Design a protein around this nucleic acid. Structure first.
Lengths: 207, 125, 60, 99, 155, 127, 79
RNA sequence: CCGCCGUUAGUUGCCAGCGGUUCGGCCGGGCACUCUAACGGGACUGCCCGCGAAAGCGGGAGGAAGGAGGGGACGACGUCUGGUCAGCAUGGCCCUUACGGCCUGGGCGACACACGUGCUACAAUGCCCACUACAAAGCGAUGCCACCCGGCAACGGGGAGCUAAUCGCAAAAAGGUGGGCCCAGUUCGGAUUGGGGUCUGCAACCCGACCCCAUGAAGCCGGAAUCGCUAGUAAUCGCGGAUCAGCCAUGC
């Protein structure tokens, strides 16, 4: 089951990074140090409602604090105060150049990490594996997709033994360069252990 | 060529003659052919006699050879067992002087492998 | 020994030959590229996850 | 005299910056030593599969450091002006050396 | 392999005279990527061939070549778990391939000094009709004869 | 006036500059029988103008670097074959069956991961 | 080992200073088998922590600048 | 990625072309030649001849290149109740003035046999000293160090250059001219050990590597048997870097 990361199989041109700036030798590591610590901080105290892209472009202390969220509404708060102090903690730890970017990718059934998160949410909310997953897949195909494959891996719903689970629909061609496929990895979890949700969204040929 | 302790190599190039000799390898033989003025290429069989005489007047009236060497070996090795300065303690074992690996390789400072009846191992299947 | 490995390498003892690398995003030292401050394994995880810039799937 | 090296990480957006230069460099100024490309740092990297002990089975990676160069000969007010003001080097950090 | 029938493919037609076998024999002198030294020495041996006995080095060569040429050779017939060691009217290609190989290694099985010595001398004996390579060759022909039994179990 | 050849085989660069004369076969700053001796690939470098033995009528001023000695020599060969493909392309269609145009893809296959040389794997334990 | 000098703990030195001018007890219990058996320790009982016990060695004189830990392997049994 | 040529590009390259030249691509100058890196063309049984009911087989040419032109990445559904909390999680159990946090040495380097992986050799296609040449890639700020001085050497002191196609690591070896060994457990082979220094680093005995003199043993080419390898491939020959204070570096 050596499914190399779709993103890893997208690096050539077929997918962009979540970071793109320069580093000159001895300084690279320090960047990625802070960079990642921010990233994760953003991830945690913000994830609340859909967000894949951990994107940030930079250079001379400037920071293109960038992010593709989902719902922006109540997540901006009651006037821009949720963003306020969060960006204040970013500006805190990264005492350099915060310039927030809070986006939105219209469709939930877009961007595999998102529906991935939804699927883990199904089981994290103690729900029928095969059912909820298959129907999320059909949601993918419904909204307007070219592929829908999301599988859940772990102590499936109960009873000791623990494998993955089938939820495939449509076409999922991923040996092809131009196929532009999004890949997400929802971190599913139960009281009695760990579950693994992997999401695959095929988007289109030669774009 | 009874220069040192009865060392007689013979009808070869002088330096090789000195090669088959304790206390002298290529180095001290070249510097022999230096501090004696003699030629390395010419044979030791046709070597003039006063030349060999001043050669023995070099070798024996400078450093020392086979006599003192292995003797002083056994002596400073008495020290290797004077208390057993661990290296020499390992020499008292009848085993290599270092601290390498006796788990296999030691095919020099310990004689040919002393056969054991296997023992058996652990089920690798 | 896991929580204190991180603190030894952080607080820094005395003499200069008393310092050692650490994959901060996986808390380990063996096979940790000093250029990234990340283990080959941490490098790998964030590389496959597609979050490492200036780097790529080497093809040469 | 005003010789400017170019540090960048991705080759596509790299020319777009240099072309942005090349145009406005000459356009407002004069002779600009054309886009001279500089041999990329292809930093060598290897690493195995799992967290494990299957020694073989590896995936090599690398750094793709692209660097270029732009050189001018005339002290146009406007050159200096926009072409050290009007900028967007997001993933490009440039070197500026008065030779 | 079980697919095609491989082949042999080209070699090199003597980078000085104009014939394959010369430089192919050179190929089968090679001291590990040393077409340099091996060909060098082969040609040393060639010029000394012409100087010792002055009869066309490729006449002496053709002569050694043929005089070490196994028309028939003993292989091993297919009867499952029983290899009746059966001869064959060998293809002339392998006859000459073997030939040059046997010449080389036989000249090498000498305890002389340098290469061109063993070469020129053993190639002289091989040409004439006494050589060690020729001993092996004559042996194999003789084995084709001692295998008169194996007259109808060829592959 | 001048005959240029792009002499190339396995990363060995040979700038071929031909002129009229007897054959000033200089390469990199030394005579031919000086930069390449005790080796037969030397003579084959001359082979291009030996299969069309005009040979002499060419002060053969070549330059050659990179790659490797013998490889340099061969690169030089193809270069010569391309310098006269210029002036007198009539030689092109005769040297084409001769094969003095086909370059060289007998290249250095990468040190593949897990082997001792290109195609040379470690020995089996097991037993 | 060293080049310009002979590596010796200052514990040795300092405690030698003390019990030499006074003429005190035997027993030298240094928790370090690193320092040198320099001629500055005559021939005294050296109970250094072997790794289990304090292996007391009676130095001769011909020990000289030849290292402490040289005198107790802790490796029980040999051959 | 690798090969043909094509466009722009010109502190590496460059007389290719001309002046000068401490007469060195060193100064002038050029961009077509090297190259570099984005942008392309280019091979499709498409054409020619024969053949089979078709696939397709063989032969001609053009052509850098034929008929899958060499490669890497990509490795499906699924198996193996495979392995891993000593990467990380995360589940369940057990420890909690200790299965926990620290210091000190010894150890993971033991030794009477055992396979497995590997290098070095057992020698004249040999190999020691010498004289000259051709790699490609990589790496280098308290890092790289040319060169001068110093020890016969190891290496040490001094001390110019570069965040680099401009300085440095650097010396390739294999080769080739020119010198010796004269089949000798040898001048092969360096294993083993004694007498001495170097640098690292708190520290080098047990536990670093490096150099000089002497020792120069095993070994005169490997049975049952098993490994690898389809073309720049086998073999042979060398280089950098990953971790790195140093190095166990024959590994990668």
């Amino acid at each position: 089951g050596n499914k190399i990361h779709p993103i890893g199989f997208r690096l050539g041109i077929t997918r962009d990074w979540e970071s793109r700036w320069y580093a000159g030798k001895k300084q690279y590591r320090h960047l990625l140090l802070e960079d990642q610590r921010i990233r994760g901080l953003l991830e945690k105290e913000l994830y609340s409602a859909g967000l894949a892209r951990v994107d940030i472009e930079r250079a001379a202390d400037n920071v293109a604090v960038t992010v593709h969220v989902a719902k922006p509404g109540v997540v901006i708060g009651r006037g821009g105060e949720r963003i306020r102090v969060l960006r204040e903690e970013l500006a805190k730890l990264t005492g350099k150049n915060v310039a927030l970017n809070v986006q939105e990718v219209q469709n939930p059934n877009l961007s595999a990490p998102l529906v991935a998160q939804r699927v883990a949410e199904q089981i994290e909310r103690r729900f029928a594996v095969r059912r909820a997953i298959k129907q999320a897949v059909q949601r993918v195909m419904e909204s307007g997709a070219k592929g829908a494959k999301v599988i859940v891996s772990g102590r499936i719903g109960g009873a000791e033994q623990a494998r993955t689970e089938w939820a495939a629909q449509g076409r999922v061609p991923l040996h092809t360069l131009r196929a532009n496929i999004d890949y997400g990895f929802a971190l599913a979890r139960t009281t009695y252990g760990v579950l693994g949700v992997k999401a695959y969204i095929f988007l289109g040929e030669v774009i | 060529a009874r220069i040192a302790g009865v060392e007689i190599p013979r009808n070869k190039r002088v330096d090789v003659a000195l090669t088959y000799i304790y206390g002298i390898g290529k180095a001290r033989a070249k510097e022999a052919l230096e501090k004696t003025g003699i030629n390395p290429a010419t044979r030791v069989k046709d070597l003039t006699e006063a030349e060999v005489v001043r050669l023995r007047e070099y070798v024996e009236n400078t450093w020392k050879l086979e006599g003192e060497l292995r003797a002083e070996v056994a002596a400073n090795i008495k020290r290797l067992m004077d208390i057993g300065c661990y290296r020499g303690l390992r020499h008292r074992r009848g085993l290599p002087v270092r601290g390498q690996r006796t788990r296999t390789n030691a095919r020099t400072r310990k004689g040919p492998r002393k056969t054991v009846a296997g023992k058996k191992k652990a089920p690798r299947k | 020994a896991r929580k204190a490995l991180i603190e030894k390498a952080k607080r820094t003892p005395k003499f200069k030959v008393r310092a050692y690398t650490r994959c901060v995003r996986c808390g380990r030292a063996r096979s940790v590229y000093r250029f990234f401050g990340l283990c080959r394994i941490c490098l790998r995880e964030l590389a496959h996850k597609g979050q490492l810039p200036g780097v790529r799937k080497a093809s040469w | 005299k005003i010789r400017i090296k170019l540090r960048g990480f991705d080759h596509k957006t790299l020319d777009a910056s240099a072309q942005k230069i090349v145009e406005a460099a000459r356009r407002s100024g004069a002779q600009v030593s054309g886009p001279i490309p500089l041999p990329t740092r292809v930093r060598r990297f290897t690493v195995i599969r799992g967290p494990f002990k299957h020694k073989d089975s590896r995936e090599h990676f690398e750094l793709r450091t692209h660097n270029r160069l732009v050189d001018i000969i005339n002290p146009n007010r406007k050159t200096i002006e926009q072409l050290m003001t009007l900028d967007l080097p997001t993933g490009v950090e440039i070197e500026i050396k008065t030779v | 392999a079980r697919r095609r029938r491989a082949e042999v493919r080209q070699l090199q037609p003597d980078l000085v005279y104009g014939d394959v076998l010369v430089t192919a024999f050179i190929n089968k002198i090679m001291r590990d990527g040393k077409k340099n030294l091996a060909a060098r020495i082969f040609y040393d041996a060639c010029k000394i061939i012409q100087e010792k006995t002055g009869q066309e080095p490729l006449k002496v060569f053709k002569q050694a070549v043929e005089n070490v040429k196994p028309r028939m050779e003993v292989r091993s017939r297919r009867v499952g778990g029983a290899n009746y060691q059966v001869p064959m009217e060998v293809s002339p290609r392998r006859q000459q391939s073997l030939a040059l190989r046997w010449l080389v290694q036989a000249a090498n099985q000498r305890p002389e000094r340098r290469a061109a010595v063993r070469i020129a001398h053993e190639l002289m004996d091989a040409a004439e009709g006494k050589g060690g390579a020729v001993k092996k060759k004559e042996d194999v022909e003789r084995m084709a004869e001692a295998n008169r039994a194996y007259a109808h179990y060829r592959w | 006036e001048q005959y240029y050849g792009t002499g190339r085989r396995k990363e060995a660069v040979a700038r071929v500059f031909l002129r009229p004369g007897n054959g000033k076969v200089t390469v990199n700053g030394q005579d031919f029988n000086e930069y390449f001796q005790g080796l037969v690939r030397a003579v084959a470098a001359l082979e291009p103008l030996r299969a069309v033995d005009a040979l002499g009528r060419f002060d053969a001023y070549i330059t050659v670097r990179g790659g490797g000695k013998s490889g340099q020599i061969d690169a030089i060969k193809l270069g010569i074959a391309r310098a006269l493909v210029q002036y007198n392309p009539d030689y092109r269609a005769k040297l084409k069956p001769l094969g003095f145009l086909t370059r060289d893809a007998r290249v250095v296959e990468r040190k593949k991961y897990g082997k001792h040389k290109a195609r040379r794997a470690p020995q089996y334990s097991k037993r | 080992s060293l080049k310009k000098g002979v590596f010796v703990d200052d514990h040795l030195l300092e405690k030698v200073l003390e019990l030499n001018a006074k003429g005190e007890k035997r027993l030298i219990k240094t928790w370090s088998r690193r320092s040198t058996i320099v001629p500055e320790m005559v021939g005294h009982t050296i109970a250094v922590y072997n790794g289990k016990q304090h292996v007391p060695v009676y130095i001769t004189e011909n020990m000289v600048g030849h290292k402490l830990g040289e005198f107790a392997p802790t490796r029980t049994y040999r051959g």
